Swiss-Prot record, chains A, B:
Subunit structure: Homomultimer. Interacts with host type II histo-blood group structures antigens at the surface of target cells.
Subcellular location: Virion; Host cytoplasm
Protein name from the UniProt record: Capsid protein VP60
Domain of life of the source: Viruses
Role noted for this protein: Capsid protein VP60 self assembles to form an icosahedral capsid with a T=3 symmetry, about 35 nm in diameter, and consisting of 180 capsid proteins. A smaller form of capsid with a diameter of 23 nm might be capsid proteins assembled as icosahedron with T=1 symmetry. The capsid encapsulate VP2 proteins and genomic or subgenomic RNA. Attaches virion to target cells by binding histo-blood group antigens, inducing endocytosis of the viral particle. Acidification of the endosome induces conformational change of capsid protein thereby injecting virus genomic RNA into host cytoplasm.
Length: 550, 550, 127
C-alpha cells in the first residue's frame, strides 16, 4: 500500500486525458516521423525517459480572476533538461511530452485550475478563453498529482532543431477563484510543473555536434550565472553589472544594441575600442591661447571608419551634450581622456590632452544644444578642463579612449547618467515600451566620476551608477548568431534569477531589450546575492513576470 | 560482393586483437560497473553507437625513425563527438572504445606502424618502447581498415565524469621506417583515426545538466572558434587577437595569468579596469613648475586595493620602466592616460593629466632603472609629455585608465613591446620553457601607438603588435573553474586550428601557457584565415605539435 | 562475367548506404507524397530513370588537405539532366537520388574520399 501523500518520480499520478490526445494522432505522428529514419533515443527503460524532472513553479493567489493565465509553456525539447541536451546531437525531433502538476494546497482551500492544449497558430495572452477549449479541471484540494500529455499537433513532418515551426502551447489558467475561507495574509498556493517525454517522443536523424551549436538554436546560453554576478560588463560603460535599474517610462537604445535578428542600428562593434576619426574640424574660442577650452566637431554621416554605419565612429557614446562654458564642470555626461592628432602625420600633439566630454549636438559655431536624433546633428567633443594652447586645424583628428567616467560638478553622486531623455538614437530603432506590468530595465554598473576617483560601491560619498541596455556577453553573442526562428514577435525569452531570499524573472524581447515585471517600481535591484541563472524558454509578452525579493 | 576499396561507416574492417582485450576484463568491467545502477545508453542499434566518427588525422613521413610516436590518445569519452555530449547528463562512464585506422598508402609504399594499449600509470613520451608491449603491426600497404579495441583497464569501479582517474593510453608509433622506393618530395602518407564506443561502453548514473557543466570538467570550451578570430582579446592590451607570436627563447608572465589550478600569481582581476592607488608619493624635479614632468611612485607590497595580491593595484601593467628624461619620447612602454587626485577629497586635479607611462623601477629619488623582480621594487609612473605645474603631495593618489598605447619615439613601428627581458614577475611563477620542438607563444594584437594614432593592421607606416600570454576569455574561464583533474603535469590540452590553406596545433600547459610547435621559428602567424577551432584532448608535452600553413 | 573495367549505364557498381537509406524512410516518403495527387513519371522501365547520366566532373589535387569540400550538391531535380528537363515540366518533386562516383586513378595512387549525407537543417560552411 502506497499512500497518496508520497509520490514516486516515475509515478504519473492520475492520467487526465484531453480530446486532442487521440490514437489517430499518435499513429499518424510515428507513421510520418518515419521519414527521419528509425526513431532514436527510444529505449523505454532509460532514466531520463521514465522520471519527471523539474520544469517550473508558479504562484496561484486569491487575487487572480477566472480566465487569468498563470502558466504557459511552449512545446519544445527545451522543456526537459535531458531532451535539451540530446537535441545537441540530433537534427530533428517529433512526438509528445507529458506534464505533471503537483498542487500544494490543503483540504481547507477551494477553487480550481484548468488545463487546455491550445493548437498552434492561436495567439496566447489575455483574452484567451482557456475554459472554452477541450480542457481538464483540477481542484486545489488535489493530493495525487495530475498529468496531461501534450500531443504533437504539427503541420510539419518533424520539427527541425534550429527552426521547429508551429508547436502547441499549454496553459494553466484559473477556472475558479482560489478561496481561503479564513481571510488573511496567507492567500497564495503553489503549483509545480515537471516534465517527461511521452512514449511517442523521438529524435529522427543524427548530426555532428560541431554543427550549429547551442549558441545558435536558442538564446539560452547568452545569460549564464557568472555573467550576471561578477564577470559580464555592460554595453555602455565597461563596468561590472551590479544591478537592474527599472525604467517605468521606457527608453530606447541605438548604439551597441543588437536584436535577435543579429543586426544593430548603432555605430559600434560589440567591444570597447577607441574612438578615432579623421578630418573633423577643431577650433578654440577667442584669440588668446591660455587656459583655453578645446572644441572639436564633425558632421554625422561622414565618418568613414566603420564597416557597419557611419553616423559616428566606433565606440562613440550615445549621450547628448550638456553644454558648459568657462570653469564649470558639466553634469551627467560621458567624459573620456582624449587628444587631437594632425591628419597629415598621425602624430598626436603634445599638450592638448584632457578629459573630453564626448557627445552629440546640433549647432556647433553658435549656441550649443543637446540633441537626440542623428540626422542633421553632428558628433561634437569638448574638453572639460583647461588646456594650454590648442589646434585649430580643419582636417584634424580626434582620439579618445574606450571607457569613460562621469562628469560631476561636485563630489556628491547623482542618479544614473544615461537617462532616456538624453540618449542619441538613429531614426528607425524600436522603442522599449512597457507591456502590461512588465517594464524595460537597464543593467546598472558602478562607474566612477571626476568628482571622486575613489568612489566605489558602498562608498560614504554615494555610489554612481551607469546603465546600459544589454550585457556585453549578450550583445557579443547576439552579433554572431541568428535567433529569428527562436522567438516570434509578441514574446520574451525568460530567465529565472534566484537570490538568497527570493526570486525574479527577466525576459528578452525580439528587439533586444530586457524586461522585468515590477510595475511602476523604480528601485534598483541589488544583484549581489544572485546565485542561480537558468532559462525557462519562450513566454508571452503580455504576462507579468514573477518578482518577489523575499 | 563489396570491394575493399570502399568502406561502410559501420564496418569495423579487420578486428585486430591484443592480449589486453580479454573476456575476463569485459566480464569484470560489467560486473563491477553495475554499482552505478543499470547501464545507460546501451541500445545497440543507435546511430552514435554503430558508426565510426572522426577523431584525428596525422602524418607519417619517411623521416620518422622506428620507435617515434606519431599518435597518442587518452581513454576518455571526449574522443567520440557523441559520448562527449552524452557525458553532460551522466555522472560516470565505464567501458571500452574501438579505434579504426585507415592508412592511405598505395601498394608501392613500404614500412609499418605498431599499435599497443599502454596500461595506466606508465609515462608516455620519447623513450617509450611501443614494440615491446603486446602490439599489432599494420602495413602501410593495407587497404581494408584495421580496428583495435581499447579495454577499460581501470583501478576504479567507474570513471567519474569530472575526475576520471587513471586511464589507458593508445599509441601509434613507427614499427618500420616508411620507404618510398622512388625518392623525392612525395615522402609522407596519412593515417586517419575514427572512434566508436565498444559493446561494453556505458554511462552509469544520471545527473542534472545544471550541475558541474562543460566548462568545469574539461577546458575544451575555453578556446572556441569566434574567440580566436574576431571577438576575444588578450590579457595585456584589450585588442583583437590577430596573430600568434612564437617566443623561441621562452618567457614568463605573472600578471593576469591563471593556471589550470584556478589561481593567479599576479595582481589583476580577469578584466580591464582602472588602476587606482591611494597614498603613493608624488613629486616634480627642480623648482620651476613650467613644462615639468610629473613623477609618481609607491613601494610594492603596500597597495591595499585588491582581494588577491598587493604588489601592485588592479590593472597595473607588468612592464619594466624604460627611463627617459626631458623632451624625449620613451620606446616600447605601456603608456596610458592618467591623472593625480588628492587623498583627502578624492577630487582629481585640473591640469595634471597626460599620457603617463606606467611601470616598475628600483630606485625612485636618484637614477631610474628597469626591474623585473617585484620584491624590493616599486610601482612607478611618470608622464611622457609636459604638464604645467604638478602635485608634490606625499599621500597623493594615481588614477590611470584601463587600456594602453605604445610609446614610440617616431611614427615608425617597432617589434612587439612585451619582450621577455622586460616583463615584471613575482618570485614563484613558473617559466614557459620550450619542450622539444614546441615553443611558447603569445597572442599578438594590433595596438596603436603615440607615434601614429591611425596605425591599424596593414597600415603603410607599419603595424604595431602587443602580445599577451593568454586570451581574455581563456583566463576568464580559468579563474572560475578548476581543471586539476583534467591534465596531469607533463601534458598539453591541444586544439586544432585549421586555416584556409593548412592547419596547426596549439596546446595549453598546466601552468597556463600556450605552445605551438614551430621550433626556432619566430615568424608571426597570420590568424586571419582561421575558420575552425576544435579540441582534440590531452596529449603528451614532449610531442611535436603538427604545424604546416600550406 | 564483366571484369570491372567496363561499367554499364544501368550498373550501380557497389552500393554504399551510410545510415540514412532506410526502408521505412522510403515508405514514409512514398505515402506522404500523394498530397500532390497521383505520382507522375513513375515507371521503372523508362530509360531516363534506369540509366546513370553525367552531372558534373571535378578534380582532386594533391594540394587538397583533409576536410576540403570537393563536390557539394543540395537535393534538387537539377542534379540529373533529364530530371532537370522534367523539372520545368512539373511543379514539385519528392524522392531520393542515387549518385554514382567513378574515380579515374591507377593502382599507384593513394588517398581517400569521404562522402556524407547532411541533414536538411544543418548550415553548411566553414565550421
Amino acid at each position: 500500500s502506497v499512500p497518496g501523500t508520497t509520490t514516486d518520480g516515475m509515478d504519473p499520478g492520475v492520467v487526465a486525458t484531453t480530446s486532442v490526445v487521440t490514437a489517430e494522432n499518435s499513429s499518424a505522428s510515428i507513421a510520418t516521423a518515419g521519414i527521419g529514419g528509425p526513431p532514436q533515443q527510444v529505449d523505454q527503460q532509460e532514466t531520463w525517459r521514465t522520471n519527471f524532472y523539474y520544469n517550473d513553479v508558479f504562484t496561484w493567489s486569491v487575487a487572480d480572476a477566472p480566465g487569468s493565465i498563470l502558466y504557459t509553456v511552449q512545446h519544445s525539447p527545451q522543456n526537459n533538461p535531458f531532451t535539451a541536451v540530446l537535441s545537441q546531437m540530433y537534427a530533428g525531433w517529433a512526438g509528445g511530452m507529458q506534464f505533471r502538476f503537483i498542487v500544494a494546497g490543503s483540504g481547507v482551500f477551494g477553487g480550481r485550475l484548468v488545463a487546455a492544449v491550445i493548437p498552434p497558430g492561436i495567439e496566447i495572452g489575455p483574452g484567451l478563453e482557456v475554459r472554452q477549449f477541450p480542457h481538464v479541471v483540477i481542484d486545489a484540494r488535489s493530493l495525487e498529482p495530475v498529468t496531461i500529455t501534450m500531443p504533437d499537433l504539427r503541420p510539419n513532418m518533424y520539427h527541425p532543431t534550429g527552426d521547429p515551426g508551429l508547436v502547441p502551447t499549454l496553459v494553466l489558467s484559473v477556472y475558479n477563484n482560489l478561496i481561503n475561507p479564513f481571510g488573511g495574509s496567507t492567500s497564495a498556493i503553489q503549483v509545480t510543473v515537471e516534465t517527461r517525454p511521452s512514449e511517442d517522443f523521438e529524435f529522427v536523424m543524427i548530426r555532428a555536434p560541431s554543427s550549429k551549436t547551442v549558441d545558435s538554436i536558442s538564446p539560452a546560453g547568452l545569460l549564464t550565472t557568472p555573467v550576471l554576478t561578477g564577470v559580464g560588463n555592460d554595453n555602455r560603460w565597461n563596468g561590472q553589472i551590479v544591478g537592474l535599474q527599472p525604467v517605468p517610462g521606457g527608453f530606447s537604445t541605438c548604439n551597441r544594441h543588437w536584436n535577435l535578428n543579429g543586426s544593430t542600428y548603432g555605430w559600434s562593434s560589440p567591444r570597447f575600442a577607441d574612438i578615432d576619426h579623421r578630418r573633423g574640424s577643431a577650433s578654440y574660442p577667442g584669440n588668446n591661447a591660455t587656459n583655453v577650452l578645446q572644441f572639436w566637431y564633425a558632421n554625422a554621416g561622414s565618418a568613414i571608419d566603420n564597416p557597419i554605419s557611419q553616423v559616428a565612429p566606433d565606440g562613440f557614446p550615445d549621450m547628448s551634450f550638456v553644454p558648459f562654458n568657462g570653469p564649470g564642470i558639466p553634469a551627467a555626461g560621458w567624459v573620456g581622456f582624449g587628444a587631437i592628432w594632425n591628419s597629415n602625420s598621425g602624430a598626436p600633439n603634445v599638450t592638448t590632452v584632457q578629459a573630453y566630454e564626448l557627445g552629440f549636438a546640433t549647432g556647433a559655431p553658435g549656441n550649443l544644444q543637446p540633441t537626440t536624433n542623428t540626422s542633421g546633428s553632428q558628433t561634437v567633443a569638448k574638453s572639460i578642463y583647461a588646456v594650454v594652447t590648442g589646434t585649430a586645424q580643419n582636417p584634424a583628428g580626434l582620439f579618445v579612449m574606450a571607457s569613460g567616467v562621469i562628469s560631476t560638478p561636485s563630489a556628491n553622486a547623482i542618479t544614473y547618467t544615461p537617462q532616456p531623455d538624453r540618449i542619441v538614437t538613429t531614426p528607425g530603432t524600436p522603442a522599449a515600451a512597457p507591456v502590461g506590468k512588465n517594464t524595460p530595465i537597464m543593467f546598472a554598473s558602478v562607474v566612477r566620476r571626476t568628482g571622486d576617483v575613489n568612489a566605489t560601491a558602498g562608498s560614504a560619498n554615494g555610489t554612481q551608477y551607469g546603465t546600459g541596455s544589454q550585457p556585453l556577453p549578450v550583445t557579443i553573442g547576439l552579433s554572431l548568431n541568428n535567433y529569428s526562428s527562436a522567438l516570434m514577435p509578441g514574446q520574451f525569452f525568460v530567465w529565472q534569477l534566484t537570490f538568497a531570499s527570493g526570486f525574479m524573472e527577466i525576459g528578452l524581447s525580439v528587439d533586444g531589450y530586457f524586461y522585468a515585471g515590477t510595475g511602476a517600481s523604480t528601485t534598483l535591484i541589488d544583484l549581489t546575492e544572485l546565485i542561480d541563472v537558468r532559462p525557462v524558454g519562450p513566454r508571452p509578452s503580455k504576462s507579468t513576470l514573477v518578482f518577489n525579493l523575499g
